């Protein structure tokens, strides 16, 4: 938790969507649709993973076409934020007949 | 090549110790002798193996 209490959001996630949960927790409660976003992230993770928006609305009892905003808020939570640190890979291509 | 600025000959208050020039706020105001520059940069596309 202390490591997760460090940059970036979701450090040592292990379990998936821990970056999303950490970003949502870091996000202030003043943001709207945050409760439904957290509900989708915590336990409707499969519901959104299956893109089961109708099933998400039916199970989470979230408002129709309004839970979409919560799902978007959950989506904007830096998934694989740790992959952001890795940005440089060496270039390697062998032209064995180089038409130019 | 350059600005024709008014000056007067006298030392004063140590601010002109050996080889100093005392430009007051005036030449700041009309900002004569403001410098111009244009500098460039670029990037490449480089269709890669990855």
Curated annotation (Swiss-Prot), chain B:
Industrial or biotech use: Co-administration of salinamide and rifampicin or salinamide and myxopyronin suppresses the emergence of resistance to both antibiotics.
Documented effect of changing residue 18 to K: Disrupts the enzyme's active center
Spell out the post-translational modification annotation for this entry: Acetylated on several lysine residues in the presence of glucose.
- Name the family: Belongs to the RNA polymerase beta chain family.
What do we know about how this protein assembles, alone or with others? The RNAP catalytic core consists of 2 alpha, 1 beta, 1 beta' and 1 omega subunit. When a sigma factor is associated with the core the holoenzyme is formed, which can initiate transcription. The rRNA transcription and antitermination complex (rrnTAC) consists of RNAP, NusA, NusB, NusE (rpsJ), NusG, SubB, ribosomal protein S4, DNA and precursor rRNA; S4 is more flexible than other subunits. In pull-down experiments interacts with CedA.
Q: What does this protein do?
A: DNA-dependent RNA polymerase (RNAP) catalyzes the transcription of DNA into RNA using the four ribonucleoside triphosphates as substrates.
Q: What is this protein called?
A: DNA-directed RNA polymerase subunit beta
Lineage of producing organism: Bacteria, Pseudomonadati, Pseudomonadota, Gammaproteobacteria, Enterobacterales
Q: Which gene encodes it?
A: rpoB
State the covered range within the intact protein.
Answer: 796 to 845 of 1342
């Amino acid at each position: 938790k202390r490591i997760q209490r460090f940059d970036p959001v979701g450090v040592a996630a292990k379990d998936l969507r821990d970056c999303l949960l950490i970003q949502l927790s870091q996000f202030a409660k003043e943001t709207p649709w945050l409760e439904e976003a957290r509900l989708i992230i915590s336990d409707h993770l499969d519901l959104l993973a299956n893109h089961d928006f109708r099933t998400l609305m039916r199970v989470t009892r979230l408002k129709e076409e309004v839970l979409k905003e919560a799902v978007n808020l959950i989506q904007s939570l830096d998934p694989r934020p740790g992959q952001s640190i890795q940005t440089s890979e060496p270039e390697y291509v062998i032209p064995d007949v180089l038409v130019r | 090549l350059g600005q024709n600025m008014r000056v007067a000959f006298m030392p004063w208050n140590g601010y002109n110790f050996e080889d100093s020039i005392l430009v007051s706020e005036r030449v700041v105001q009309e900002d004569r002798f403001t410098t111009i520059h244009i500098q460039e940069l670029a990037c490449v596309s480089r269709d890669t193996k990855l």
